[PDB]
Structure formats: C-alpha cells, structure tokens
Ligand binder design. Structure first.
Ligand SMILES: C[C@]12CC[C@@H]3c4ccc(O)cc4CC[C@H]3[C@@H]1CC[C@@]2(O)C#Cc1cc(CN(CC(=O)O)CC(=O)O)nc(CN(CC(=O)O)CC(=O)O)c1
Ligand SMILES: C[C@]12CC[C@@H]3c4ccc(O)cc4CC[C@H]3[C@@H]1CC[C@@]2(O)C#Cc1cc(CN(CC(=O)O)CC(=O)O)nc(CN(CC(=O)O)CC(=O)O)c1
Ligand SMILES: [Eu+2]
Ligand SMILES: [Eu+2]
Lengths: 227, 227
C-alpha cells in the first residue's frame, strides 16, 4: 500500500521467512556459452516471479518494478552463482549438472565466492543481500513528487532489511562491533558485484555482436535495457 | 609495518584527523572536455600524494599500492565532485571556477550529490568514505600467501574505518539502530559510484578513441590500467 505497506510491519524473522519462501526453483542446464545463456534465460523467468514476493516490491509502480529488474538482473544472477559455488573452492556451480573450475570475470566470481566462504555467509543473510541488490541497483537511475515518494519507500524497505541483517548477526553470537564490521564487509562486496555485472554485461554484449544467431528473447531484452 | 601497523593503533579521532590533514589542495581549471580532463589530470598527481597519507596504505607492496590507485581513481575523483556540489543543487562544482548545471553520467552524479545533501553528509564521514573506496575498489582484483596477507590487512584497516564511521555517528546523537541504517545507506551509495566510474571510464575511453589528439599522460595511464 506504500503507506500501509506490509513490508514495513514485518519483524526480522517474518522478513527472513518470506524471503526464504520466495526462493526460486533449482534449475539444471539443457557450446558452453549456449548452456550459460540458456540457463541465464530460464532463470530470468523465475526471477521475475521471485521479485513479486520481495517485501516492498509490489508497492512500486510497474514501470519502477521493471526498471529495478532491468538494472539488477545480472548482479542477482551472479550473487546466486557465487553463493552456489561457495562450497566448491576453485569451482563455479552454475547448476547442479554444470560445475566448472580453475586453471577475468570468472576469477572475480571465484574470489567473491571465496570471500563468502571465509566469512561463512549464511542463507538467511544471502537472501537479505539478494533483495538489497534488487531494491538498490536501479534506485539512482529512475525528478517528480512521485519519484521521490518511490525512492523514499525503497530507502525505507532497505533500512528494514538492514535491521533484519543486524538482527540475524546479533542472534548468532556477535558483538555490536562485530555486527557493524560484518555489515560493512557484506555491503562492500556488493560494490564488486556491481562491478562484475558491468563487466559481464560488456562481455555478453560482445558475444551478441560477434555471434550471428541472436540469443534468447528475455535475456536479450534485459541486456538491451542497459544502453 | 603490516603487523606493527600504525593504522590499527589509531583511535577514531586520530584516524579522522589524519584523513583531514591528508586532504589535497583546492585546484582550479586552466573545449569543455579539455578543461575537465586537464583538471582530472592535475588532481591525479595530488591523489597519488593523498593516498600515501591514508592509514594502512604505505603498508602494502608498491605494486598493490599502484593497483589500488589504478582501480579507484575515477570513483575517488567522482566522490570528490559529488561532495563539492552537495550545496549547489542542480549543479556540479568541478572546481570553484568551474560550476555547471541542469537542463546520463552527469545526472547520476547530481542525484548522488542530492542523496548526500538530503542525508546531510559530514566532512568527517566524507573522508572515511573516500579511503574505503581507495582500499576496497581494487581488493578483489589483485593467489599466494602474501596476497592473502595483504587482503587481510586491507580488510583490517577497512574494519577500522567502519569503527570510526560508527563512532562519528554515535558522537552525533544517533541510536544504535540509526547508526547501522546510516552505515548501510552510505556503503550502498558506493555501489552507485562504482557503477558511475565504470560508465565514466567507458565514456572517457570513447573520447580517446574518437579524438585524434591523445590527452594527458597520467590520466591516460590510469585509463589504460582498466583493460
Ligand atoms: C553473462 C555471462 C553469461 C551468463 C553468466 C551466468 C549465467 C547463469 C548464472 O546463473 C550466473 C551467471 C553469472 C555470469 C554470467 C556471465 C558473465 C558474462 C557472460 O556473458 C559470460 C561468460 C563466459 C563463459 C565462458 C565459458 N567458457 C568455458 C570454457 O572455455 O569452456 C566457454 C567460452 O570461452 O566460450 N567463458 C567466458 C570467458 N572465458 C575467457 C576465456 O576462456 O579466455 C572465461 C574463462 O573460461 O575463465 C565468459
Ligand atoms: C571522466 C569524465 C571526464 C572527467 C570527469 C571529472 C573530472 C574531474 C573531477 O574532479 C571529477 C570528474 C567526475 C567525472 C569525470 C567524467 C566522467 C566521464 C568523463 O569522461 C566525462 C564527461 C563529460 C562532459 C561533458 C561536458 N560537456 C558540457 C557541455 O556540453 O558544455 C561538454 C561535452 O558535451 O563535450 N559532457 C559529457 C557528456 N554530456 C552528454 C551530452 O551533453 O549529450 C553530458 C551532459 O552535459 O550532461 C561527459
Ligand atoms: Eu572460457
Ligand atoms: Eu555535455
């Protein structure tokens, strides 16, 4: 209701449950780039559905919902990957039947996955991060009274997810200090994910340009939204 | 000493003073792109000097020092600008004698400046942010025992700057909660600055490619480091 919003009245545990229930279905893959863009294409359908279930999200205009999707899709895909590969050091689990390794975007992705493991990132935190990406990546790329009213909403939901995260950390045995150091640690990693997304976008765009065959519709649509 | 490091033994106020003393000299400008790349070129000299004085920085290898500079230079330039223009709504103060306005990278830069104003960002916080950019932007783009020892250092200094920031906020009248919400707010903005840096880099590169005249040496060197 963007004023009576259900998202602002959710406790930290409620928020966490909602996010966990919203988690998309495990997908499997069906050349190497072709397997990746196929998976990517199919995950995007499920991510559009996932976003609906993210507290605060349906309270924005449809155009703003689409803008956030267009802005954050790769980062979201990437944080998923980085997360799946957390336990496979030197490897990238794109799907259970698609695991690759060591021996550069892929290297940045491996490092990030390592960083997560060394921090021992938790599934409850993961889902928090993924939503922040959704709500934040587009936000300074939307002017008007409605525009700032939308921005103010997103900022309010983001503050709400911060509280959750902080709550989670406190629930586990962590000093106030340790809480704000881990919060900082995790958010700074999203800088790197933005960066990787910008590089992956450039890469994907190259392949499009040098391939003759246009690749999947949805995936192409989310790529074209950038530029 | 990266073990006896002076940076890890600095209190929050000490850290803040050091950062403030390290602040570079006000520069003035001397076509529009030519004025901007000139200023940019001249600021870079002073930023190399500024970095030396950033606690923790001289404790890294020289190659890692250069890598961090090459990685973070535009973001740092941009956070400077965004900060200078905070008080000139709809305008960008590149230098006191170079002020531009409204009527897109520049728009992202204005929005960020607005965001800062609405948050009423403080000079003590500004300098904290600028250093985090320095220490963080390159860090997941450095493998070996020394490599992780460097990473562990940077992470330790970053944790130290988090404490400072949090301290500052507490010093001003802020709830624990307000502290972790503002910390989140500020770090998420660095995602956007990374993003803008990636876009500005692409832009700068275009101008280089379509201009015949090569522009300034230092500036060209920091651009070439990307790619
Ligand atoms: C967008 C993206 C494709 C889709 C990716 C994706 C999909 C789903 C998902 O859930 C998460 C993510 C996360 C990352 C997403 C990719 C990042 C950029 C992309 O376009 C690519 C790649 C790609 C792939 C391969 C696979 N490669 C495997 C192999 O050679 O068999 C096939 C390819 O060379 O054709 N190589 C490179 C470049 N390669 C550089 C090179 O080898 O010199 C990176 C490297 O392998 O380390 C880039
Ligand atoms: C790298 C950079 C030049 C240096 C910049 C800088 C320098 C020092 C510093 O302390 C901070 C920063 C922060 C930003 C830095 C710029 C971002 C990208 C850059 O290459 C540019 C520009 C630029 C400039 C101008 C100036 N422009 C002013 C004017 O037209 O007279 C001259 C130009 O058109 O030649 N226009 C555009 C694109 N323009 C798109 C266009 O107008 O359709 C943006 C727009 O004006 O909103 C891009
Ligand atoms: Eu490859
Ligand atoms: Eu222009």
């Amino acid at each position: 209701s963007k004023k009576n919003s259900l998202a602002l009245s959710l406790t930290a545990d409620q928020m966490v449950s909602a996010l966990l229930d919203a988690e998309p279905p495990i997908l499997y893959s069906e050349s190497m780039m072709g397997l990746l863009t196929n998976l990517a294409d199919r995950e995007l359908v499920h991510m559009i559905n996932w976003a609906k279930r993210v507290p605060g999200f349906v309270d924005l205009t449809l155009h703003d919902q689409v803008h956030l999707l267009e802005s954050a899709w790769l980062e979201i895909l990437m944080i998923g990957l980085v997360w799946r590969s957390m336990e496979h050091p030197g490897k990238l689990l794109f799907a259970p039947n698609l695991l690759l390794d060591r021996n550069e975007i892929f290297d940045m992705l491996l490092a990030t996955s390592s960083r997560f493991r060394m921090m021992n990132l938790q599934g409850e935190e993961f889902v928090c991060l993924k939503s922040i990406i959704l709500l934040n990546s587009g936000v300074y790329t939307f002017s008007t009274l409605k525009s700032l009213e939308e921005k103010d909403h997103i900022h309010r939901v983001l503050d709400k997810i911060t509280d959750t995260l902080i709550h989670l950390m406190a629930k586990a045995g962590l000093t106030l200090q340790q809480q704000h150091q881990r919060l900082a640690q995790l958010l700074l990693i999203l800088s790197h994910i933005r960066h990787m997304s910008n590089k992956g976008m450039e890469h994907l765009y190259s392949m499009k340009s040098k391939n003759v065959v246009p690749l999947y519709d949805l995936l192409l649509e989310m790529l074209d939204a950038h530029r």
